[PDB]
Amino acid sequence: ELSEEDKQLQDELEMLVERLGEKDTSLYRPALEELRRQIRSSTTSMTSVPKPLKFLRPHYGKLKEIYENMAPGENKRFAADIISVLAMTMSGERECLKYRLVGSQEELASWGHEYVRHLAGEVAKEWQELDDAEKVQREPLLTLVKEIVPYNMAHNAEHEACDLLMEIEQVDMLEKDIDENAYAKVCLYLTSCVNYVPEPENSALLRCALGVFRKFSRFPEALRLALMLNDMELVEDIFTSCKDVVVQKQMAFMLGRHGVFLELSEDVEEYEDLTEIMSNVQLNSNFLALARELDIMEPKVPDDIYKTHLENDSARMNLASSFVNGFVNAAFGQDKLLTDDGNKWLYKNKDHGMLSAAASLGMILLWDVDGGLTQIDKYLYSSEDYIKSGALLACGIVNSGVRNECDPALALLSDYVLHNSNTMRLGSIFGLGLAYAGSNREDVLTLLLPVMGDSKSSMEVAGVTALACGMIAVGSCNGDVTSTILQTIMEKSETELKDTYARWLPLGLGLNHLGKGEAIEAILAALEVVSEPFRSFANTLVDVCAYAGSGNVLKVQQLLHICSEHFADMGAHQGVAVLGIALIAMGEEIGAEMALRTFGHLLRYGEPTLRRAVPLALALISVSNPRLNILDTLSKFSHDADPEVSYNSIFAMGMVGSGTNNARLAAMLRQLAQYHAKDPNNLFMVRLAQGLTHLGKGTLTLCPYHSDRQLMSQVAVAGLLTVLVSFLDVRNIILGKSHYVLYGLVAAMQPRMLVTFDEELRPLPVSVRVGQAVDVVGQAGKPKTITGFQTHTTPVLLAHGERAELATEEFLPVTPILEGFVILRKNPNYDL
Amino acid sequence: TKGPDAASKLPLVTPHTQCRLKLLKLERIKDYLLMEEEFIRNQEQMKPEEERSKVDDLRGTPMSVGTLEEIIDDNHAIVSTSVGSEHYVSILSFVDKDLLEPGCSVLLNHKVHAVIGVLMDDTDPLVTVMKVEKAPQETYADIGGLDNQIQEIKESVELPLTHPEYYEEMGIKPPK
Amino acid sequence: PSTFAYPAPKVSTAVLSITAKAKKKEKEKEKKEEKEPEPNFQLLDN
């Protein structure tokens, strides 16, 4: 029951509700004033159950009707406030919202935080239920979001504040209400919510959250988002708006790390430095610089990696020998086998063996158009000039991941892209694609145009050719290149398609359409002309390339259906389908970790063609990421009976452990070698897996994600896709004549380091507490984003999923996210 | 070595403030889960014999489980019935004369006791419930303090599985 | 009223996250895209 206070309050409210029975003059103004006080007093209190609302369980029918008759002026409105507040406790939303809509205005703050939020929900609920059929109701609701949103901004309720605007579909106002003490909370939230949000709201959020970064002059943060939307114009403005050269310098280093090039006008000061920084010429000096501090300049040899001592010269295994002396010593600037006696080494490889070995010569020395190009002066012109493709890939590979003002790739390669010999051309187009991947340069794209139409070119020349064009125009949907690809793809004949290398033609179509699912509706329309199977296959694969990293559950559901189907011309469509889920889902950690379960189900409940793709699919999900659960999953299928699954699982292990130097993966890899010693095909690739797991002695990562895993690297996602899909048929492609395709990864090959330099670029060894990154979203205050701290004296290495923070407040980094090369600005606030 | 049958933990949704970031992340987990159910169910439905069917006819139903004790000949072994008796049953062809090991739990024909199948994974129900399937939900960030105690318990049960190189590169055997 | 005698001759999963939003947006895209003389007088032989 109640007490003297409670029972009396029940009567006092009871008298007030009852007295409104008649139309007495001193019953409407007097009573409604009392309800206004008591209801306001309790509701604007601690979370105490609003005694007025608990006692007041009356019906508004009498007052709602007389509301109209009883003084439609102020006396009418007053009743609305009392009934409206009583509505929030009950379930009368439509009426509960529309009372504050029509009733007395006053102000939202006067009622109570609990009331304000409830109106927030209903306002969002009504706005969503209100379509474009009429804005007449929108102006009032829009007016409400004008006042309430400022209410949340102050009250630590930015989450509801951002949540409130997102519900309305319109989030402009945050620009005008965010305080210097709030942009971090709001800007972080949108970046975290943007990935999950579907099209097109997700795109709108990125720009808006990007905009908020603008209003408070946090320029480097605007950079990360600008690329996330993958729109160059907003990048160019920030490039232009950055009146501070230092911020200009840094935002170029993030522009470069993404592989994004914007033609810099000479009006911009330090154009060469910005051009050289953007061209990534300074990368080589650091990489060698990084090595000297780390003491890893000495090159390695295959025998030590394999550890032949512990285990209880065919041309193939020589290739695996040749490859491991690639990746493992790649980018170190010196190899002990491919630089001194190479003519001797290659001569024990028959044709395609020569191709692979020669190409590794360029990958052994990346990012040196001079040193590598000078380490490119003893083979290519071989008595078996067939290996010319080998150095041509090395020629193209060296230019991959960098841009030189002298355009070496086109010069050397062009004279041989028309070379009649089929093998000579394979290196030309492929190597060229690596060098200018994502460049989208019209010249090289144009020069690659005749390659498509050159009928004399063999299909293997063609398949690489379309792939080469795709890798250049990755993520730009280049109308000319797409047209060339789109025009070229249609002209293909049915009989010539049935070959495996025709599997590469659609790949080039997508690689042009990576990251833009809006424009791929048309591209899938044009492809419908060609007849199946490759019509359906290209449709799926083109479909996947459209949604690279979108996080679109819809496409994944669409993609999962294709894999789910149980049918040979249908299995190519399936295999690209499973790899489809891997690419689409690999943006967010929440979804990506879930795709593992789906991948696992596709293996126990899968079929021949699917079971081969799953081992590859896991490869893209966790590239350079030795998650134990995934690495274990590849192993338990690393011995499988089907040769294709055994190979793909072994390759996946190599990718997952790429550059991680994971001891367990190595020990796991070594044991497999002993198990599969008999079969050269397994032993070759298990040996290869050990090769990928030591990429750059671990000083590189093929992960396509930078910027706290947020900023996607378009050119990268092109590479992994080529090898992975090309691995969809390993025996014809991998085990066949196309050992060179493994060089497709070189596009995404990037360094992972923590070298800290002083403001003058001298290495400034700063205590950097580096550990597993922990999200700061939704954590009030200054949450620690690093856990499992292990103070390292920079330079340092960050295994994937790690973040480094400057443990000394002596400096204030220009860019908030400490990845790659960061300009540490000495803190003016710090006092010794 | 069946491999680690690790627990099955759904990813974690944080923020916890009950904000829309929370709803979206739970939805994403649900979306894939709804998708994952779709594949399991749509794999049995979309999914629409003369060698095994002959085998199952020789075995019949049911099939006893006693303990092998001696492989007398290649085609004869002595199997102890589930009561502690003995039997000089015959080893049929379909059985693998490799997995047949003294002490193994053998599947026996019911009418004419004859080794018909080797029942690996016969671990007691009393120890097969001892295995944790659904991983508990308290992450190292739910335990406050105990940084000196946690590290001591993370250098014997977690690190020795992730970075084995450190220990074997130094001569220790990971504390166990 | 008529003639007689001689007779005769998966599931869409909810995915409620964005299923409806895509479908409601898809419909909008759809809008953008946009015997009295019978037998019983049977002429039958004997």
Rounded Cα–Cα distance for residues A673 and A660 (Å): 19
Which residues are within 8 A (CB) of A536 and not within 5 positions of it... i.e. 6 or more apart? Answer: A569, A570, A573
| Contact in structure between A325 and A335 (CB atoms under 8 Å) | yes
| Contact in structure between A80 and A67 (CB atoms under 8 Å) | yes
Three-class secondary structure of residue C16 per DSSP: coil
Report CB contact under 8 Å: C22, A554.
yes
Would you mind telling me the total number of residues written for chain C in this entry? 46
Name residues 427-456 of chain A within 8 A of B (Cβ).
none
A110 near C CB under 8 A: no
B175 sits in the region (left: phi over 0; alpha: psi -120 to 50; else beta) called beta
Q: How would DSSP label each residue in A260-321?
A: ------TTSTTHHHHHHHHHT-HHHHHHHHHHHHHT--SPP-HHHHHTTTT----HHHHHHH
Rounded Cα–Cα distance for residues B95 and B107 (Å): 9
Q: Which helix (H) or strand (E) holds B65?
A: strand B63-73
Report CB contact under 8 Å: A556, B11.
no
From the centroid of its chain, how far is CA A654? Answer: 21
**How far is CA A64 from each of CA A80, A214, A530, C29, rounded to the nearest angstrom?**
8, 48, 67, 42
Which residues of chain B make contact with C14, given a CB cutoff of 8 A? Answer: 34
A192 near B CB under 8 A: yes
User: In sequence order, what are the beta bridge partners of B79?
Assistant: B68
Which residues of chain A make contact with B9, given a CB cutoff of 8 A? Answer: none
Method: cryo-EM
Which residues of chain B make contact with A601, given a CB cutoff of 8 A? Answer: 36, 39-40, 43
The set of chains that have 3 or more CB pairs under 8 A with C is A, B
Rounded Cα–Cα distance for residues A212 and A190 (Å): 10
Nearest Cα of chain A lies from the Cα of B31 at a distance, in angstroms, of: 7
Using CA coordinates, name the residue in chain B closest to C16.
Answer: B31
Rounded Cα–Cα distance for residues B125 and A486 (Å): 62
Rounded Cα–Cα distance for residues A733 and A740 (Å): 9
Rounded Cα–Cα distance for residues A54 and A89 (Å): 9
| Contact in structure between A695 and A709 (CB atoms under 8 Å) | no
Report CB contact under 8 Å: B40, A605.
yes
Nearest to A323 by CA among A340, A346, A343: A346
Nearest to A565 by CA among A513, A596, A609, A524: A609
Cis peptide preceding B4, ω within 30 of 0: no
Q: Which two tokens stand for residue A657?
A: 């452990």
Rounded Cα–Cα distance for residues A241 and A222 (Å): 11
**What SS3 string covers A685-701?**
HHHHHHHHCCHHHHCEE
Nearest to A555 by CA among A541, A543, A538, A570: A543
From the centroid of its chain, how far is CA A429? Answer: 28
Report CB contact under 8 Å: A554, C13.
no
User: In sequence order, what are the beta bridge partners of A771?
Assistant: A803
Rounded Cα–Cα distance for residues A122 and A95 (Å): 10
CB atoms within 10 A of CB A675: 14
Cis peptide preceding A533, ω within 30 of 0: yes
State the helix-helix crossing angle for A232-241 and A201-215, rounded to 10 degrees. Answer: 0
Name residues 646-675 of chain A within 8 A of B (Cβ).
661, 663-664, 667
Rounded Cα–Cα distance for residues A675 and A640 (Å): 12
| Contact in structure between B49 and B64 (CB atoms under 8 Å) | no
Residue whose entry in the numeric block shows the structure tokens 């158009």: A369
* Residue from B20, B22, B34, B37 to probe the interface with C (highest C Cβ count within 10 Å): B34
What is the longest distance spanned by two Cα atoms in chain B? Answer: 71
Rounded Cα–Cα distance for residues A169 and A128 (Å): 8
Which residues of chain B make contact with C13, given a CB cutoff of 8 A? Answer: 34-35, 37-38
Q: How many CB pairs under 8 A join A and B?
A: 109
As for chain B, the residues directly before each break of C–N over 2.5 Å are 48
Using CA coordinates, name the residue in chain A closest to B10.
Answer: A594
Name residues 648-687 of chain A within 8 A of C (Cβ).
none
Using CA coordinates, name the residue in chain A closest to B13.
Answer: A590
Strand A786-793 to strand A711-712: parallel, antiparallel, or no bridges (unpaired)?
A: unpaired
Report CB contact under 8 Å: B42, A564.
yes
Residue A249: how many CA atoms within 13 Å on its side-chain side?
15
| Contact in structure between B32 and A595 (CB atoms under 8 Å) | yes
Q: Which two tokens stand for residue B172?
A: 């220790």
Annotated resolution, angstroms? 3.5
Rounded Cα–Cα distance for residues A635 and A768 (Å): 35
Strand B90-91 to strand B114-118: parallel, antiparallel, or no bridges (unpaired)?
A: parallel
Three-class secondary structure of residue A548 per DSSP: coil
CB atoms within 10 A of CB A221: 22
Q: Which two tokens stand for residue A19?
A: 């007295």
A246 near C CB under 8 A: no
From the centroid of its chain, how far is CA A306? Answer: 34
A366 sits in the region (left: phi over 0; alpha: psi -120 to 50; else beta) called beta
CB atoms within 10 A of CB B162: 14
| Contact in structure between A706 and A258 (CB atoms under 8 Å) | yes
Using CA coordinates, name the residue in chain C closest to B42.
Answer: C10
Cis peptide preceding A608, ω within 30 of 0: no
Q: Which of B30, B34, B45 sits opposite C10 (nearest CB)?
A: B45
Which residues of chain B make contact with C18, given a CB cutoff of 8 A? Answer: 31
